[PDB]
Amino acid sequence: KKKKLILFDFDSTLVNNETIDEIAREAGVEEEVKKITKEAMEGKLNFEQSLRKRVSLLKDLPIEKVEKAIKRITPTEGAEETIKELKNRGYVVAVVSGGFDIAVNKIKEKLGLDYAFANRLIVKDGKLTGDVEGEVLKENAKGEILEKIAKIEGINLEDTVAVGDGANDISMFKKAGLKIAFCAKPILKEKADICIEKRDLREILKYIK
Ligand SMILES: [Mg+2]
């Protein structure tokens, strides 16, 4: 009857991988970038500064190496089954990520998602420039996007569900009707209505609808 909306974070939630850490491996700086990613997700760094710092380390990386990394990204256990059941229960399904469109768009197309929002790696002459731009950078960014999607769809915020795992999902939780922390960092678990620790997205279904 009443339309419903579910938003998923991308890295480590809808997919197994951390996009930026996989690209960093191709640039020879996996260790270094992984450390910053962990600190950012734990809430110990400002997200935007942490993302720009990581992307700066990727300066000059060829697009072919970026694509090699992205091709390794795989959906989390239970992703397809969960998305299918959500659509059957009447949900609009969206993904919001502080990651990158070049990676997120592939999964949007593969999984048939209704909406996908992510940042953008800047490229020139077939190589990363070391810069990033986008609308999923500020602390309140994901929550603002949740509100925008719900408004387009005419969905009351009480009929929204957010599934997240890192510090940058806090604003998404703030605006959501039901807050699910999926194998998440402490800072987000403290804000959650439900904390799931089994790494299988199907585990959220019992709490849905
Ligand atoms: Mg994440």
Curated annotation (Swiss-Prot):
Pfam families: Hydrolase
Pathway participation: Amino-acid biosynthesis; L-serine biosynthesis; L-serine from 3-phospho-D-glycerate: step 3/3
Needed cofactors: Mg(2+)
Residues at which Mg(2+) binds: D9, D11, D165
GO biological-process terms attached to the record: L-serine biosynthetic process
Temperature dependence per UniProt: Optimum temperature is 70 degrees Celsius.
UniProt keyword annotation of Magnesium present: yes
Keyword Nucleotide-binding assigned: no
Superkingdom: Archaea
Active site: D9, D11
Record's signal peptide: none
Protein name: Phosphoserine phosphatase
Organism, scientific name: Methanocaldococcus jannaschii (strain ATCC 43067 / DSM 2661 / JAL-1 / JCM 10045 / NBRC 100440) (Methanococcus jannaschii)
